Design a protein around this nucleic acid. Sequence first.
RNA 1: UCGUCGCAAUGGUAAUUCAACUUAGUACGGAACCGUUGAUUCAGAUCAUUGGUAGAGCUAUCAUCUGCCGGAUAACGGCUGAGCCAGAAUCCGUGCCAGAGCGACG
RNA 2: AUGUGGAACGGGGUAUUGUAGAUUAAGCCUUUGUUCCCAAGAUUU
Lengths: 43, 316, 171, 58
Amino acid sequence: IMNCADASCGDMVLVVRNAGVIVNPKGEMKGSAITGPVAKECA
Amino acid sequence: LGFLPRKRASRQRGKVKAFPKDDASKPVHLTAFLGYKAGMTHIVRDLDRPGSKMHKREILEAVTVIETPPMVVVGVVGYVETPRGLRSLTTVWAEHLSEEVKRRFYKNWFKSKKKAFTKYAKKYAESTQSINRELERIKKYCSVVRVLAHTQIRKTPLAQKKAHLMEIQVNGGSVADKVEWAREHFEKTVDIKSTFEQNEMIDVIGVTRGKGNAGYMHRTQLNSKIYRIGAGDDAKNASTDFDATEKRITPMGGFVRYGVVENDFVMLNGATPGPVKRVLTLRKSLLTHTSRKALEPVSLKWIDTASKFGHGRFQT
Amino acid sequence: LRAQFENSNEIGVFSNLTNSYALVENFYSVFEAELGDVVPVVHTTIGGTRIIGRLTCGNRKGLLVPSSTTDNELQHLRNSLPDPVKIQRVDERLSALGNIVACNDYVALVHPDIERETEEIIADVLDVEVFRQTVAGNVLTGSYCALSNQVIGAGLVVNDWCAFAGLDTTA
Amino acid sequence: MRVHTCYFCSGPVYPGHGIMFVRNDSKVFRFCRSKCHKNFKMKRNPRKVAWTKAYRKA
RNA sequence: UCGUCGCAAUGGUAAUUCAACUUAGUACGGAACCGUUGAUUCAGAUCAUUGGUAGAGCUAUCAUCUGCCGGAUAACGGCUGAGCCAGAAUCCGUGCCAGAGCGACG
RNA sequence: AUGUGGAACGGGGUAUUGUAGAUUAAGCCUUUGUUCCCAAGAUUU
C-alpha cells in the first residue's frame, strides 16, 4: 500500500515505496521537483 | 464450465475423485489426510531463496488450520479391476472397533442397541481363519486395497462423535506389502502428521464453507502450500523459528468458532475451502511437480496467535 | 573499468568500493574478482537495498553502512565485516550514506545535508573524514562523487586505488 | 528481533496486526491493537490513554 | 429393510498474455533455445493481516492463496520405398465438477 | 433414547467500544460449577 508518501520503492513510473512519495498532479512541484533531483542516485 | 454448475457437496467429507498414482516399488503408505478446517493464522514464512524477489521475506499469510492427526485406521477393503470398472472385491476391517465408528455406521447409536458389527466382531475374533481366508483372497484377487480408516471425531474435541470413515487406498506397495501394512495398521490411529509433515505444497481437497442461500461445494486446492502441522495438543502449535515460545495456532483465547484443536492440525499457507470445524480432505498430488519453487521450502519464521476475535493484535 | 551490469550502469551505487573493502551477481562477482581480492567486496544487501553506493558508504575500517539495513542484514554485515571492515550503522541524516558520504580513505565527504553525527561516524569509525559537502551541487556526495583514497559515484565503484565504472557509465 | 513499539499504546505492536499511523513523513505511529489503531490515527498520547502502557508508567 | 464405504455409464470443463534478468553485447549494429524473477486477464477458494460495513460475521483483481502432462493429429519436414517418424494455443485423454446404473460391508 | 449424557443457564476466559466499567459468544473460547430432563411418546417398515 503505497500510502506513506514522502510505482515501487523509489520508482514512480512517471512512489517512495509502502509509500507513494509525492505527486506532481496538475503541475505541483511536489512530484515534479523530487527534491530537485540530484542528491542520492539522481545526481 | 469446470466447477459449474454450482452444487454444494452433500457429503461433509471431501470425497476425492482420484488418488495419487500407486506404485508397488514405493513403500506401502497412504495419500490422504482427514483435515477439519480449524482456523487460520499469519504464519510468517521467511522465503529464503536467492534470485527470488521475496528473498528471506517473512510471508505473513493465512496458515489455514485444519485439524488432522490420529484417525482410526480400522482395516482394508478389496478392490478388483473389472471390465465394467473398479469393483470392491471384499471389505475386511479389524476385529477391534470404536464407538465413534459404530456411531458413524448408524444414526441413533445411543438409541440403537449398539449392534453395529456385533457378530462381525465375533466372527473377526473367533473365526479368524475365515477373516484370514478372505484376506488371502483379497491379496490374491483384488487389484487395489482400500485401507479403511475412520476419524477421531469422538476422540478429538468435536460435537460430532461419528468417525469419518475413509476408504483411503494403500498408496504404493505390492499386494502383500499393502496387506502387511494394513495388518500393521489394523485397529490403529493413522496420524496425518505421521503421514506427512505439511511443510510444502499439497493437494488438499474438500467442500467449501456454506455461506447461505451457496458454498460447501467439493473443491481441490491444487498445489496447496502447507506451512506446518498445527499440533493443537502441543503448546508449540504456532511456535516457529522466530516466533517460538510455545505459541498456539489457535487464537489467544480460542479460535473463532473452532477454539483449540484437541489434536494436530494441517495449517496451510494460503486458502482452504471449508468453514471452522468443517472436515477437510487433504491428500497427496495425483501427478508430480518438480518445480523449483515447490521444491524450495519457505522457512516459517514467525506466526500469529493474536486474540483475533477482539484485539486482533494481542498475541498473548 | 566499465563493468557490464544488467541495463543500468550503477556499479558504484550497487557496490560502494571502500578503501580496503569494496561493499559489493556477475558484476558483483567481477567486483569481488578484481577489487574484492584486495579491497574486500562484501556483498551488501541492506534488506533489499542491495545498492551500497546508495546507502552504505565509508572506508573499509568502519564503513558507514546504512542503519536502514535490517537487524539480520546489519548483524550479518557487521559479523562478516572484520575490525578493518566494520559496517558502522549510519542512522543519521546520511542514512543513504553510500550516496550521501563520498566513501574514500583520505576523506569520506558526507552529504551537505548529512548530520555531523554521520559526518563523524565515517570520520572516526571509517578513518575517513566525512566532510558534509554537496558534490557538484548534488547534496549526496557519494552518489555524485566517485570518491577514492587517491552521479559518478553511483555509476563508478571507486576503491582506494580503483575506479571501476558501470555497464554504460558515461565516458 | 525487536518489533515496532506502539506509539499510541506504548506496547510492542504486533507484526501486521494493529496499525501504524504512517503520514507523509512515514510517522508510523504503531498501535498495539485495533483500539490503539484508532488512537494511533488520532496520534493519541500513550500517557493519556489508560490502556496504553505509558499511562501506567506516568 | 435401514445404514456405511465405494465403483463410474454419461455430461461439463480452463487457463491466458506480457515484461525483465541470465543466455549475451554472444551467434551473425544486434538475436534465439533453456532457465529464473515478476506482472495482465480469467477461474476457484479463504478472512491470518489491512480496509469497508455497525469485537463477531460478511466482504474487497481495497486483502490472501491456488490454477498440469499424456496420447493422437493438421499444416509442414523426413524414413524406407503404402507402412512408420517428427510435428501446432488444434483434437482426444490425465486432472477438476455433477453422479444414472451398480459393487462390497454391518 | 441414564452419562465427557446433552440442554440450559451461573459463569470464567475473551475481547469491544472505551476511559476502568458493561456486553461479556451470540458464528470468540471455555467450564473439576449448578440444575433440568432422559424412546418420552407418536409414526412407518
